[PDB]
Design a protein around this ligand. Structure first.
Ligand SMILES: [Zn+2]
Ligand SMILES: [Zn+2]
Ligand SMILES: [Zn+2]
Length: 251
């Protein structure tokens, strides 16, 4: 996603944290002036201008392009060296949960987890390798040139003309999505990537013309918006498991 999609996933999630995860997220965020779950959500996309070294190391962590293999993930083939979103999200979840690490290490892992749960729910981050997740599919959208990747990351969301305060309650108004019965941080990333890939491959998502407009928006923007809500609910369920699961009896 672009920055608004990432923030909206975080804002949906933030309100769904259990008290244990609420306290721990807030404690990690408090170590960085002005940080909120929403404000850190775009951070991993900004690393060219914030941390170039980490930016180079983590560029491939935003994607897993499995569509040519019918959306059936295989880590050795699709994720050599762990360099894809499935394995990155698993590892960063482990790091985030490791209370023996420094607050700085765990806050960095939180930034990645918040961002990557968003990206792994973006269909065009789990699509074809050969066209760079739809980036090479250039099209006219209304009167403007774009590409299929950008259309899904931000172009359709932008048609609402809403800031986050207007968009958030619209996402919250949707019918509740069906989640996994319990979060498994090591297994769910593959499930989510495969589901996102199947959307990339659904009828008409790749359009039959290179001039699209309101008919495309009206059919597919609801699906993009459903994926934001789903991503936010899944992010809260994951943070509740990773940061909200300690067996505690102190008053
Ligand atoms: Zn993104
Ligand atoms: Zn993207
Ligand atoms: Zn990203």
């Amino acid at each position: 996603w672009g920055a608004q999609g990432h923030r909206l996933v975080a804002e949906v999630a933030d309100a769904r944290l259990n008290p244990t995860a609420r306290a721990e997220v807030d404690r990690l965020l408090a170590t960085e002036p002005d940080a909120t779950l929403a404000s850190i959500a775009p951070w991993a996309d900004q690393l060219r201008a914030k941390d170039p070294g980490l930016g180079r190391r983590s560029a491939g962590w935003h994607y897993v392009n499995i569509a040519e293999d019918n959306c059936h993930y295989e880590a050795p083939k699709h994720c050599r060296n762990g360099n894809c979103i499935v394995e990155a999200l698993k590892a960063q979840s482990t790091i985030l949960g490791d209370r023996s690490l420094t607050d700085g290490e765990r806050l960095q892992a939180l930034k990645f987890v918040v961002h990557l749960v968003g990206d792994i729910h973006q269909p065009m981050h789990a699509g074809y390798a050969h066209d760079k997740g739809g980036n090479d599919f250039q099209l006219q959208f209304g009167n403007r040139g774009t590409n299929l990747h950008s259309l899904w990351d931000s172009g359709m969301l932008n048609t609402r003309k809403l800031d986050d305060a207007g968009y958030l309650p619209l996402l919250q108004s949707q019918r509740a999505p069906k989640l996994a019965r319990q979060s498994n941080p090591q297994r769910d990333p593959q499930t989510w990537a495969e589901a996102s890939c199947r959307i990339s491959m659904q009828a008409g998502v790749y359009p039959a013309t290179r001039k699209i407009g309101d008919e495309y928006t009206e059919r597919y923007r609801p699906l993009a918006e459903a994926q934001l809500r789903l991503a936010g609910e899944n992010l809260a369920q994951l943070l509740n498991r990773v940061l909200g699961a300690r067996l505690e009896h102190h008053h």
